[PDB]
Design a protein around this ligand. Sequence first.
Ligand SMILES: CC(C)(C)CCN1C(=O)C(C2=Nc3ccc(NS(C)(=O)=O)cc3S(=O)(=O)N2)=C(O)[C@@H]2CCCN21
Length: 557
Amino acid sequence: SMSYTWTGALITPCAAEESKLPINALSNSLLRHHNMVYATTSRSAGLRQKKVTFDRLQVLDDHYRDVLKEMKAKASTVKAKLLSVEEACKLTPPHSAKSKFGYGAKDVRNLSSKAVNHIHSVWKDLLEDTVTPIDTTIMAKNEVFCVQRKPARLIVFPDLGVRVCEKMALYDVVSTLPQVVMGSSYGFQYSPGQRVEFLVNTWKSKKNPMGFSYDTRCFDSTVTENDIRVEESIYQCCDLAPEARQAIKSLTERLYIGGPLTNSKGQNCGYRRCRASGVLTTSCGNTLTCYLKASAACRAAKLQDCTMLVNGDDLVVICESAGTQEDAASLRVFTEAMTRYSAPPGDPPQPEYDLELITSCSSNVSVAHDASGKRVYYLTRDPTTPLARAAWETARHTPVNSWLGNIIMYAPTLWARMILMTHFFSILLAQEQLEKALDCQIYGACYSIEPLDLPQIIERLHGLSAFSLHSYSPGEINRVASCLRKLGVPPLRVWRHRARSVRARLLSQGGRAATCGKYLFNWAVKTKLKLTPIPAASQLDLSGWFVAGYSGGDIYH
Ligand SMILES: CC(C)(C)CCN1C(=O)C(C2=Nc3ccc(NS(C)(=O)=O)cc3S(=O)(=O)N2)=C(O)[C@@H]2CCCN21
């Protein structure tokens, strides 16, 4: 079937959309080549619609059913609970889109009776009716990039009332099921420090390692009715309350499988027969479907001892090599199999024989040295998009502070420490806003974080070495330097100078500000301080950080 059918009506914005990088007094201190950075808008959505609209064919074999049988067997060991309305309301982000039915996210969060009553009636209706398609809104995402332009990504989501019901029915399932079914292969269970450890151990477990990432062309669009019905059959394997069972089937038939699309102005835009990016089960569904299809494709292509690492639609596979001729021919069969399962690639996969050349979750393995001269593996990426977005957020306040999520997940890196840490701590200092909790997304869920808790956070997710890493690789150094040149970002020597200043100001203030200055900026000074375990690091409640992915699932933690 066609992933989408269109009425010809336009995908529309809510407010005005900026595509040009906004510029304030602070912009040039980060980035000179302003015209390199742009944000997507609804006005390029027609180009995206084109791309994501295709027929899907699916041919399912015995390897496919075998793996599926395996997944169901493990899924049947899961016992999952129904969440109360109240519990589910509290999982709702403050900034979440308001209901068409006269209440918003904060009404939900403070449990107003208009919110609670409508939610109760959406749930009742789910139990009563398993056939009537639920309405969704299609919006264009506004995202920031550096020019190479990408058209806007689309987001399809149901009304807030329905989203709270999804939580009630499926939050425990999507939080717990994926690790049980997929074990060590489930990407979203890992801190960055654990993920790199898993990658290295896995590489090191192979006699002759070969790895490749697999980029599916528009994963959501490739997801068929069958796939969505298959993922539901996996949810129903769990020990569920009968109201959860009924709710899950109903959300599946009425929402997940497909339904009508409406713009922000209330016009009918068409119909969807593929994955919605803005539902609770988007991340879990993609991961189950990706791992199912990949595992089955691995058996068809006869890949030796293939180890999967899956994060929603993101797939890296590490296996035994059979030499370059055979590896290359194997990956073609792997791709043919995936293609038959309706997950063809955008870029064709290539085998890699160096772990550091594999990009997965937009990230590659790299190596640095700690205090004791010990080699240390850490995860990194091309700093171009992180810096473009940092540049946007330097002049515009945003719902998600990507800069902050990046500092958390890329703490050990050269660019995050020298540029991102320096720039943003300087800004918090000037505004006396160090104490101010900021929102950011990690693995799709929204977190309220205090910038001053960063030292503890970094210690827990990466280890202390993150505060002591030096002697980065020429590869990493070259990519960073060429990013700064391309973007017009001051050289790293400037950032070192600025940091000594930022550091001194932090230390001057004592308390947690001083802690940040000591741990985050030890690299800036020649005469280093001694970095011991942070007392507060062990006290931090970081449970719920690396349990699951929730991309598009409206989760606040
Ligand atoms: C350093 C690390 C450990 C390699 C992580 C890098 N990395 C992320 O991979 C990430 C992330 N990964 C995803 C991958 C694939 C999908 N596909 S889907 C739509 O669910 O089907 C979704 C998501 S996400 O939205 O849950 N967010 C983060 O949220 C964090 C935060 C800054 C960047 N960082």
